[PDB]
Design a protein around this ligand. Structure first.
Ligand SMILES: [Zn+2]
Ligand SMILES: [Zn+2]
Ligand SMILES: [Zn+2]
Ligand SMILES: [Zn+2]
Lengths: 198, 284, 460, 367, 351
């Protein structure tokens, strides 16, 4: 289709390819483009090497996606055999373990897009099955995922993220609400929790 | 097109005595007061019932006269109410006079008067969004001696000018006193599109008033009646005191200094200058 | 509009001075003159000496001389002044009675007439009897226009309307319908209506026991300000008292009951001269009650209403079923053809809509307005401040029923040479006053501005 | 890039700017062709115009989009010379050497306008951009196929020329597998991988072409109280308010005011000989710029001889204008000559004053 | 519940002279539909407003306008001190429509070239109204930024609805590090006030730099009318000014003499400056129950003070926002008016 032409018109595309060297080269160009003007898209694989160690800071990551939810049994029955062992040896059923692994990889992918608290960034998902897994996710992800944000359509998704990006762009720096969530130098911890010694 | 003529009559009993001192004591301000009352009535009649206002400047402050801030809590007869109320207030003000009143002769609150009057004009215009008021104020001053040109009021006067121009409010001035062209006032009327009138003392102004102090409401096709040229060769050197032509103005200080630089620390802001720059100036 | 000022100058000079004896009348007529004349008169009032005209010419500059002629022609027509060819020059000065009366009025004169008012316990409430005066005015308006029930008992008022031919109604059959006079009555909102009625009372009440000086004294004393105390009791002529009672019957006097008291100064006399706000059992709150409808879709959307007002609207639009806030009506070529049957011109209605029905069209006229006058030179396209579309449709209906073209001015001649004619034509094209011209005939029928300017240039 | 002496010597640039404005070339020639000014200083006044022009000129457009686009965003106009034809083709050439070389090689024969670009569509726009055409229209022939073969290994060697030893944060190479010697599995169909390498290579080439960096008190109160009383003493007879009192005084006031009205009125807020008017205007512009150069130089300072030449020329110009006035009085008469003298009075005074000031300074330096 | 600036902590220095080179953005991005006509039309309208305002408040500075179309920076108004030229230029542009991509780098380089003639005491500046989310540079950018900060050229930019990393770096870089100048907007009114706050001179905490006396002279109006004659545009103009030294006519302006090249001013420009240098202490809002002061205004005479015990109404607040040094009341309207338009505090003038 012509779909790639448009994203070309806006940003850069940087695919993920099996040879590690070329992958590293592409990744560093992605960083170099992000910190430069032109926006750049890197699309990779959840099971793949990219998610393993690479970090995505403020600039280098704003909006991860999860096209689909990662599952393995595409291929053959080694997972089936291990899962057989799992069920017989541990009181764990197939779909339980499979969902657990999938959400493990999903959370590992998602967590990369933040570094500090000054950073921020959308973390969308995409699949019907995700809606029921909302509890499998790690807690701190789940908290931000309110109920009303479930099975949203793409259109309301774009609306919401637009509002987000605008709002976060604001220099919302009261610096007195940050005495709540930063525990400033040597004191707020000292004061607060030396009193909380209760 | 209604107009808000807000006279600003200053009355220094020091300057009132000077007026008695000037020429003969052939009549106190009473002449001016009566002429002002009549002119005020005239304007009050001319238009379609357009309000007025009057402020004073006595030796130790200013106080309104006509709009008559909450106190309890003939001829068309509104003329009657305006005039009798004004005169009652002014007699009250004259009661406000004594030696402690004689004490704070250091200043002359005219600038405060003009500023407050402008604020009043803004208040009235803002409240009366409908039927926009082509307003314009006035100034009556008893020109006395003992100070050839008081300058400690120089800036607030010009701030008044700029406010006036932005607010589009011509401001006409009538100085009654010695033949000393009130330079700042002169520039004020000229810049804000006004009219200057340096009458002699004892003549019944009413003709002067009704002639050349009544054509500024909302007309302006008519030649104003200003005196001789209004040279803008502005303030004398802060250090020297002689009127400057080819100025020499420091910096962030902004003070205008004569051809005599003290060589360092312009004598209004402590700012030593580049001696290299000093020599560059001295290169002449 | 008969332009009562024209009636004022109609009356002869001696009776004009007779009127000028009354200072309050002098003041009231001062209120009416064009501003140029106002300023000139205020100049002359004090310097007790005639003044050459040359000064009063040089007082005014360029692009505003038209008003100079307006003022001088008006003042001469009503003869407030006396031009004086003393030394062959022009020694202007007012009718000295006018001057002295005015000057007395400015500084405590002896005008016991204007001072006829009395100050006492003005127990008159704002709504108090003001609502009664408004109700009387509405009742007479409805009876003249013709309501379902016309309680208008003004036998004198009815006689004035009929003999004056106030409205095209068959008074012989009792009809009170809209004629050309009736159409105008529907047109002149408040000042026009009150003025037409006052003129009618003047014309009808002109035979015997008039005392026109006392008549105008009473009228203007009413319009001047609240006389209040002792007005009806003391401050009135005998025929003056009769005229005051008649006016109070006509609503224009808000006299209290008991048939003997001070003058009851109703707001209406104020409305005679004010040219200002128009708003008047015990309920009536509306700064914008009149909820008319008029947009670009030529429809009638009404929420706010007033029964006589909406009847006036119906005078050029159909009615089918009155609704709660609305009345079934849609303005079309037929709707105004209703008034075209009465021959009503689509002229007064223009400014009427621009002014009336605005209590419901405030936001409409604001969005059309958009302050697109200072923005007009920059953005060359108007934002339909005064809707031209509706104007074009109305003109089209008017044109459909009319088919005739006329022009104002006067025929001109004595263009001896082609040079003068060509130069005058070029100057007129510069000023846009030449309707049409031709050098072959050396004639045209336009406004007198070109001739005026050429004559002034030649003589001075 | 821009320097005072550089713009001074940029003679071709200066003449181009002469072509820029008719007014400019006119004033310049009449300052030159009239045996007047060396162009050097004439520009020395006008330098900022030169700098501005030069910068407005040498302004390389970016590579980036249009460069790319020239392969993607350009798939429709199969007609003649499409949008930005020369611009697009030069973007292509800087973007891809191969097409430039092929077009150049196919100038003496085989026109690259219509048929060249037609076959180019197939050949290149299959080679670059979309998937391997392989089958279908294999019009990639002759020069097309040759350049295809070339560009293959060419892009190869380019990519070779691209490999940095990336800083060890990102080093995926050393990161993967080059820690251990392990035994995994792998399970995650040729072609299109080349497509991905194509887009990577394009982007990196673009970025690299950009890293390339190519009495008081007592009596006071007394009088005050007196007045206060007078006021309180009923009085305030507004009737007695002057009115004008002395008719004479009144008259005098009126006199003053009409005098002032007249004088200020004299402010009416159209020459005869249009050709002589324009000629005089040229003379004024000439004398103005001449004096401009002096009042620059006479202030600034060691180029005294230049000032001397300027002064001699200015004196010549003054005498010239004197003769001009003489001729004007002779021919145009007086009224027209009077109008000319009025039009030229300010400039004449200024230049005369400049001459006098120079004479004074020269006397001071000499004596 | 109050929204006030706590304190002004550079009331000692500003750049009084300026040479601000506003650079618009006329590129395909500005054609989206987020602001009522578009981005572009609203932008240019507000740009006109800002031009008027800025040349009012800083009436001694110059200004130049730059667009960014088709990746090119095409100067649309030479750096000049006459507002009308720039106004007309913007008028002309507004009827023309954007294209191409915004080439921030080219605009930056064109500016840096443009501001070279500006002398040392004058201060430079740029104001990028950046609208898009990308640039397209024909060169290194950090090269340019380094050249900029080498040439002491502060830059402030007003992004549209996003934050671009490079622009943030740019503002943080030139302005001596202290990042506050990359303010981006979230509403049209926010945009109006953005330009408004761009009008004023710009302090952060100035490094100790060269401060230099500047020669200038004031003119005197002319008298004659028929003798219409001009030495700055070579026309007939019914009467103007005289350079005190060059001694040649100059059409009305604060312009520089076109004969001897010295600055010309009257004073009122200097008066505007004075107003900007030493402003007032922000008026304090008096305590609701602890005021016990006069029940009126002071500068005006308003009747908006309190209500005296009304459950929640009186519990709200007491409109008595009163300035410090004169310690006199002032209703809200009077305080807003004083702190906006005229800066002579009424009472503080009088003592
Ligand atoms: Zn000029
Ligand atoms: Zn000069
Ligand atoms: Zn107030
Ligand atoms: Zn204060």
């Amino acid at each position: 289709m012509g779909i790639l032409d448009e994203v070309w018109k806006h940003k850069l595309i940087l695919v993920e390819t099996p040879d590690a060297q070329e992958t590293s080269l592409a990744l560093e160009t992605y960083r170099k483009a992000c910190s430069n003007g032109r926006g750049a898209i890197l699309l990779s694989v959840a099971r793949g090497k990219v998610s393993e160690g690479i970090d995505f800071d403020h600039q280098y990551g704003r909006t991860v996606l999860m096209i689909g939810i990662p599952f393995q049994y595409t291929e053959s029955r080694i997972l089936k055999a291990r899962l057989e062992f799992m069920r017989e040896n541990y009181r764990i059923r197939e779909n339980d373990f499979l969902s657990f692994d999938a959400m493990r990889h999903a959370a590992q992918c998602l967590g990369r897009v933040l570094r500090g608290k000054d950073d921020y960034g959308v973390m969308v998902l995409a699949d019907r099955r995700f809606s029921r897994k909302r509890s499998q996710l790690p807690k701190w992800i789940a908290q931000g995922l309110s109920d009303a944000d479930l099975n949203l359509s793409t259109d309301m998704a774009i609306s919401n993220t637009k509002q987000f990006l605008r709002t976060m762009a604001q220099p919302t720096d009261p610096k007195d609400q940050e005495g709540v969530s930063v525990w400033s130098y040597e004191d707020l911890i000292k004061h607060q929790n030396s009193r909380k010694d209760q | 097109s209604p107009s808000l003529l807000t006279v600003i009559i200053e009355i220094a009993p020091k300057l009132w005595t000077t007026f008695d001192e000037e020429g003969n004591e052939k009549g106190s301000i009473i002449k001016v007061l009566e002429a002002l009352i009549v002119f005020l009535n005239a304007h009050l009649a001319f238009n379609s019932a357009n309000k007025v206002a009057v402020i004073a400047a006595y030796s130790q402050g200013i106080k309104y006269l006509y709009p008559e801030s909450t106190s309890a809590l003939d001829m068309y007869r509104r003329f009657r109410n305006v005039d009798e109320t004004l005169v009652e207030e002014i007699y009250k003000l004259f009661e406000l006079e004594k030696k402690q009143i004689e004490q704070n002769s250091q200043r002359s609150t005219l600038a405060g008067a003009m500023s407050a009057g402008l604020t009043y004009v803004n208040r009235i215009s803002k409240e009366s969004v409908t039927t926009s008021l082509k307003s314009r104020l006035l100034v009556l001053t008893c020109g006395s001696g003992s100070s050839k040109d008081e300058i400690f009021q120089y800036i607030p006067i010009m701030n008044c000018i700029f406010s006036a121009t932005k607010m589009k409010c011509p401001i006409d001035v009538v100085k009654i006193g010695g033949s000393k062209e009130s330079t700042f006032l002169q520039q004020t009327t000229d810049a804000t599109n006004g009219v200057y009138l340096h009458v002699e003392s004892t003549e019944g102004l009413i003709q002067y008033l009704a002639t050349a102090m009544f054509i500024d409401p909302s007309l302006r096709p008519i030649i104003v009646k200003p005196n001789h040229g209004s040279v803008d060769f502005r303030t004398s050197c802060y250090l020297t005191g002689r009127v400057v032509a080819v100025g020499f103005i420091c910096s962030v200080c902004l003070c205008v200094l004569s051809i005599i630089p003290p060589g360092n620390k312009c004598p209004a802001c402590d700012s030593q200058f580049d001696e290299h720059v000093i020599a560059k100036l001295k290169r002449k | 509009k008969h332009s009562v000022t024209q009636y004022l100058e109609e009356i002869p000079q001696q009776v004009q001075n007779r009127l000028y004896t009354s200072p309050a009348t002098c003041l009231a007529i001062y209120r009416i003159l064009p501003p140029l004349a106002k300023f000139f008169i205020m100049a002359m009032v004090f310097n007790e000496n005639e003044v050459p005209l040359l000064d009063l010419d040089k007082w005014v500059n360029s692009n505003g001389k038209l008003q100079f002629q307006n003022a001088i022609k008006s003042m001469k027509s009503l003869h407030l002044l006396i031009p004086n060819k003393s030394s062959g020059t022009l020694m202007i000065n007012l009718n000295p009675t006018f001057k002295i009366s005015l000057r007395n009025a400015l500084t405590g004169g002896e005008v016991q007439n204007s001072f006829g008012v009395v100050v006492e316990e003005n127990v008159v409430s704002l709504d108090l009897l003001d609502e009664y005066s408004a109700n009387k005015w509405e009742t007479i308006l409805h009876f003249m226009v013709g309501t379902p029930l016309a309680k208008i008992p003004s036998e004198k008022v009815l006689n004035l309307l009929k003999h004056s031919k106030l409205m095209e109604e068959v008074n012989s059959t009792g009809e009170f319908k809209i004629t050309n006079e009736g159409f105008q009555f529907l047109l002149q909102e408040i000042n026009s209506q009150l003025w037409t009625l006052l003129l009618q009372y003047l014309k009808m009440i002109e035979t015997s026991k008039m005392d026109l000086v006392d008549v105008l004294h009473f009228i203007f004393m009413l319009g001047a300000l609240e006389v209040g105390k002792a007005y009806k009791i003391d401050a009135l002529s005998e025929t003056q008292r009769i005229m005051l009672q008649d006016m109070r019957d006509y609503g224009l006097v808000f006299q209290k009951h008991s048939n003997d008291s001070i003058f009851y100064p109703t707001k209406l006399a104020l409305m005679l001269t004010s040219d200002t706000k128009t708003i008047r059992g015990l309920k009536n709150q509306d700064i914008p009650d009149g909820s008319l409808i008029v947009e670009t879709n030529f429809k009638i959307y009404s929420y706010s209403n007033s029964p006589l007002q909406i009847a006036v609207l119906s005078l050029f639009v159909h009615l089918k079923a009155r609704f709660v806030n609305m009345v079934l009506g849609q303005i079309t070529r037929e709707s105004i053809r209703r008034a075209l049957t009465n021959g009503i011109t689509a002229d007064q209605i223009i400014a009427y809509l621009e002014t009336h029905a605005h209590p419901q069209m405030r936001r409409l006229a604001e969005e059309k307005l958009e302050k697109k006058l200072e923005l007009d030179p920059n953005c060359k396209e108007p934002l339909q401040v005064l809707p031209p579309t509706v104007v074009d449709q109305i003109r089209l209906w008017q044109l459909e029923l009319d088919r005739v073209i006329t022009y104002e001015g006067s025929l001109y001649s004595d263009f001896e040479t082609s040079q003068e004619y060509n130069l005058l034509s070029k100057y007129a094209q510069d000023i846009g006053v030449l309707l049409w011209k031709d050098d072959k005939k050396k004639k045209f029928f336009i406004s007198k501005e070109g001739n005026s300017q050429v004559l002034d240039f030649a003589k001075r | 890039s821009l320097s005072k002496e550089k713009l001074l010597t940029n003679l071709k640039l200066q003449q181009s700017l002469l072509k820029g404005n008719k007014v400019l070339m006119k004033v310049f020639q009449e300052t030159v062709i009239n045996a007047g000014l060396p162009p050097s200083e004439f520009w020395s006044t006008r330098i900022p115009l030169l700098r501005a022009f030069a910068l407005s000129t040498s302004q390389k457009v970016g590579p980036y989009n249009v460069l790319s686009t020239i392969k993607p965003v350009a798939s429709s106009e199969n007609k003649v010379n499409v949008n930005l034809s020369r611009e697009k083709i030069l973007n292509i050439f800087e973007n891809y050497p191969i097409v430039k070389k092929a077009y150049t090689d196919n100038v003496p024969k085989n026109f690259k306008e219509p048929e060249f670009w037609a076959r180019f569509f197939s050949s290149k726009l299959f080679r670059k951009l979309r998937g391997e055409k392989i089958m279908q229209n294999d019009r990639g022939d002759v020069i097309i196929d040759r350049y295809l073969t070339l560009d293959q290994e060419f892009d190869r060697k380019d990519d070779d020329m691209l490999l940095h030893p990336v800083k060890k944060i990102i080093d995926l190479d050393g990161n993967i597998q080059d820690d251990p010697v392990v035994r995994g599995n792998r399970p995650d169909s040729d072609g299109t991988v080349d497509i991905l390498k194509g887009m990577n290579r394009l982007s990196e080439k673009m970025i690299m072409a950009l890293k390339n960096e190519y009495s008081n008190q007592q009596m006071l109160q007394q009088l005050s109280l007196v007045m206060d009383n007078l006021i309180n003493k009923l009085d305030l007879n507004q009737v007695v308010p002057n009115n004008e009192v002395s008719n004479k005084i009144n008259k005098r006031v009126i006199t003053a005011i009409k005098i002032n009205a007249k004088q200020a009125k004299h402010n009416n807020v159209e020459v005869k000989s249009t050709l002589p008017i324009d000629l005089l205007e040229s003379c004024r512009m000439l004398h103005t710029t001449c004096c401009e150069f002096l009042k620059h130089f006479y202030i600034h300072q060691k180029q005294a001889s230049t000032v001397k030449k300027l002064y001699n020329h200015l004196k010549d110009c003054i005498e010239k204008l004197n003769e001009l006035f003489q001729d004007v009085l002779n021919g145009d008469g007086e009224s027209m000559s009077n109008t000319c003298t009025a039009y030229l009075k300010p400039v004449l005074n200024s230049i005369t004053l400049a001459t006098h000031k120079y004479d004074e300074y020269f006397n001071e330096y000499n004596n | 519940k109050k929204r006030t600036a706590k304190k002004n902590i550079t009331p000692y220095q500003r750049g009084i002279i300026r040479s601000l080179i506003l650079t618009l953005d006329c590129s395909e991005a500005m054609l989206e539909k987020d602001l009522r006509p578009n981005r572009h039309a609203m932008i240019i309208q507000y740009a006109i407003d800002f031009v008027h305002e800025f040349f009012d408040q800083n009436p001694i500075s110059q200004m130049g306008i730059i667009i960014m179309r088709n990746g090119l920076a095409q100067l649309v108004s030479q750096v000049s001190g006459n507002p009308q030229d720039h106004i007309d230029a913007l008028k002309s542009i507004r009827k023309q429509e954007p294209k191409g991509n915004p080439s921030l780098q080219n605009a930056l380089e064109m500016a840096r070239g443009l501001l070279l003639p500006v002398p040392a005491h004058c201060t430079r500046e740029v104001l990028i109204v950046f609208g898009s989310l990308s640039t397209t540079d024909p060169g290194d950018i950090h090269q340019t930024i380094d050249s900029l900060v080498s040439e002491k050229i502060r830059v402030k930019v007003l992004g549209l609805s996003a934050q671009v990393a490079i622009c943030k770096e740019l503002c943080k870089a030139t302005n001596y590090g202290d990042e506050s100048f990359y303010k981006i907007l979230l509403d049209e009114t926010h945009l109006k006030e953005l330009f408004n706050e761009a009008v004023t001179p710009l302090p952060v905490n100035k490094i100790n730099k060269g401060f230099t006396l500047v020669k200038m002279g004031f003119p005197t109006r002319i008298f004659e009318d028929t003798p219409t004659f001009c030495s700055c545009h070579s026309k007939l103009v019914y009467g103007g000014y005289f350079c005190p030294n060059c001694h040649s006519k100059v059409c009305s302006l604060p312009t520089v003499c076109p004969c001897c090249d010295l600055m010309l001013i009257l004073s009122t420009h200097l008066a505007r400056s004075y107003h900007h240098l030493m402003p007032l202490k922000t008026f304090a809002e008096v305590p609701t129950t602890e005021k016990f002061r006069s029940e009126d205004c002071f500068s005006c005479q308003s009747r908006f003070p309190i209500l005296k015990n009304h459950k929640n109404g009186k519990l709200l607040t007491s409109s008595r926002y009163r300035c410090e040094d004169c310690k006199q009341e002032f209703c809200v309207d009077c305080d807003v008016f004083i702190h906006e338009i005229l800066h002579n505090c009424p009472g503080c003038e009088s003592k």
